[PDB]
Amino acid sequence: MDVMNRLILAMDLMNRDDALRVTGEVREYIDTVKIGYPLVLSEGMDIIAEFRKRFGCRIIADFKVADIPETNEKICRATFKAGADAIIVHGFPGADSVRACLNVAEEMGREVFLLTEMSHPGAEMFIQGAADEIARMGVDLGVKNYVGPSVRPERLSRLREIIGQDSFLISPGVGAQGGDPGETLRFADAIIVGRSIYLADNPAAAAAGIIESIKDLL
Amino acid sequence: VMDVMNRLILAMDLMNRDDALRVTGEVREYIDTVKIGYPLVLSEGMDIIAEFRKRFGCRIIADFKVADIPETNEKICRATFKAGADAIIVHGFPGADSVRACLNVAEEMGREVFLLTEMSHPGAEMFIQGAADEIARMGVDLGVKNYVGPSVRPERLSRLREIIGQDSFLISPGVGAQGGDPGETLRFADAIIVGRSIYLADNPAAAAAGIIESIKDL
Ligand SMILES: O=c1cc(O)n([C@@H]2O[C@H](COP(=O)(O)O)[C@@H](O)[C@H]2O)c(=O)[nH]1
Numbered sequence: 001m002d003v004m005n006r007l008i009l010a011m012d013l014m015n016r017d018d019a020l021r022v023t024g025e026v027r028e029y030i031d032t033v034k035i036g037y038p039l040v041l042s043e044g045m046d047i048i049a050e051f052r053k054r055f056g057c058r059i060i061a062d063f064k065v066a067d068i069p070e071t072n073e074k075i076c077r078a079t080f081k082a083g084a085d086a087i088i089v090h091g092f093p094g095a096d097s098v099r100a101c102l103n104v105a106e107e108m109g110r111e112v113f114l115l116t117e118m119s120h121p122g123a124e125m126f127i128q129g130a131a132d133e134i135a136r137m138g139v140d141l142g143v144k145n146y147v148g149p150s151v152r153p154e155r156l157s158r159l160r161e162i163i164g165q166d167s168f169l170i171s172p173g174v175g176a177q178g179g180d181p182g183e184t185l186r187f188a189d190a191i192i193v194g195r196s197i198y199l200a201d202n203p204a205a206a207a208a209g210i211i212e213s214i215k216d217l218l
Numbered sequence: 219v220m221d222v223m224n225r226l227i228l229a230m231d232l233m234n235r236d237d238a239l240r241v242t243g244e245v246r247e248y249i250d251t252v253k254i255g256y257p258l259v260l261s262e263g264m265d266i267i268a269e270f271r272k273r274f275g276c277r278i279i280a281d282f283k284v285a286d287i288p289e290t291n292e293k294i295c296r297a298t299f300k301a302g303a304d305a306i307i308v309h310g311f312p313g314a315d316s317v318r319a320c321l322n323v324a325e326e327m328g329r330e331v332f333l334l335t336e337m338s339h340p341g342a343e344m345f346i347q348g349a350a351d352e353i354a355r356m357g358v359d360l361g362v363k364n365y366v367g368p369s370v371r372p373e374r375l376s377r378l379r380e381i382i383g384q385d386s387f388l389i390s391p392g393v394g395a396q397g398g399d400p401g402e403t404l405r406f407a408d409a410i411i412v413g414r415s416i417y418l419a420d421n422p423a424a425a426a427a428g429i430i431e432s433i434k435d436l
Pocket residue numbers: 010012036062117118119120147148149172173174175176177192193194195196286287290
């Protein structure tokens with residue numbers, strides 16, 4: 001996956017007008033948008049097709065899929081019907097639940113991203129101790145795309161070690177949560193950035209600034 | 219605690235509005251509580267909650283297995299309650315802050331959180347099972363009053379009931395299609411969740427009535 005400027009916009013605004021305006025304001029800087037439940041549950045799954053119509057961007061559905069295999073299959077089918085290019089799945093519920101998502105993605109020409117460790121403080125309680133094993137599970141299942149946390153670079157580096165240089169790794173927690181763009185790109189292929197851009201007085205300048213700070217990594 | 223008619227909750231995971239409405243209507247006299255998940259919501263929009271409330275006298279539990287960072291969890295809960303859900307189901311494995319985020323919105327908005335502690339599918343053994351007792355205890359410490367645990371492992375369901383105490387409210391999926399027994403499950407759960415063995419039956423009403431007959435003395 002070729003992400004323009006190694007920068008993925010986390011569009012978690014919950015108003016259609018604001019979401020479209022802000023994404024429009026930064027369109028010259030990005031070609032990949034992560035759309036999550038805050039936007040989808042507020043404005044409907046049709047918003048995905050609308051982003052494609054307006055921007056032509058690729059769309060990653062950040063739905064943190066975490067159900068039993070049967071339900072996971074349904075969630076992925078509905079998500080890919082709506083035009084998502086990729087979906088993010090939790091690894092914690094185990095291998096069968098991930099495989100269900102891989103099946104639908106293969107069937108519809110889409111990608112699965114495996115979330116292995118998360119960026120918030122609570123991730124330390126249960127997820128962190130399972131994270132390396134979840135990553136190895138991804139490798140065993142043939143997962144090629146992964147998500148890991150900007151805020152703990154030593155953990156992000158370990159995740160990269162496990163999955164190898166061939167795998168694709170994207171990383172949230174940059175900006176608002178304290179992650180540094182450049183340090184993160186030592187290990188991740190692309191950074192995910194939400195509030196630092198979409199709550200900025202000037203989203204375009206915010207995006208340009210981040211890109212400026214990593215220009216030697218582009 | 220919520221007063222669930224016949225101790226039976228319909229898991230409405232059909233993905234077509236016409237079918238979902240038809241089946242739910244057919245079992246209306248047996249069930250006043252409906253669990254709506256992402257298969258239906260991602261297919262038909264959050265307005266499906268409004269339509270169920272309009273058409274039926276049913277409480278709605280939004281089975282969204284909320285599993286994000288605290289900030290995103292808050293947004294998901296707000297959107298879900300705004301749409302008319304009485305309650306939302308949240309994963310415990312992302313840790314205490316992520317759960318507390320949901321509890322805080324639920325308190326502010328006058329609605330309820332259910333904490334999913336262990337799951338019913340084979341993959342749950344890999345990571346979730348080993349964390350389940352601690353996730354449950356964390357729920358108790360956080361003041362969670364409503365819980366979800368698996369019918370298919372009676373010993374595990376029993377332990378979960380022990381941890382949360384008799385006053386807590388506990389609902390349990392995996393009955394029917396996944397092999398869980400209604401009667402045995404209600405030894406520990408307040409209510410059973412049933413999907414396919416009702417909604418895929420030639421006569422969903424007869425299917426519901428049959429389950430209810432089997433647990434009449436309970
Ligand atoms: O570990 C993770 C995984 C995520 O998907 N995310 C998501 O990435 C985005 C972070 O946005 P922000 O830059 O505003 O912190 C949010 O959409 C959040 O749900 C995260 O923050 N941490």
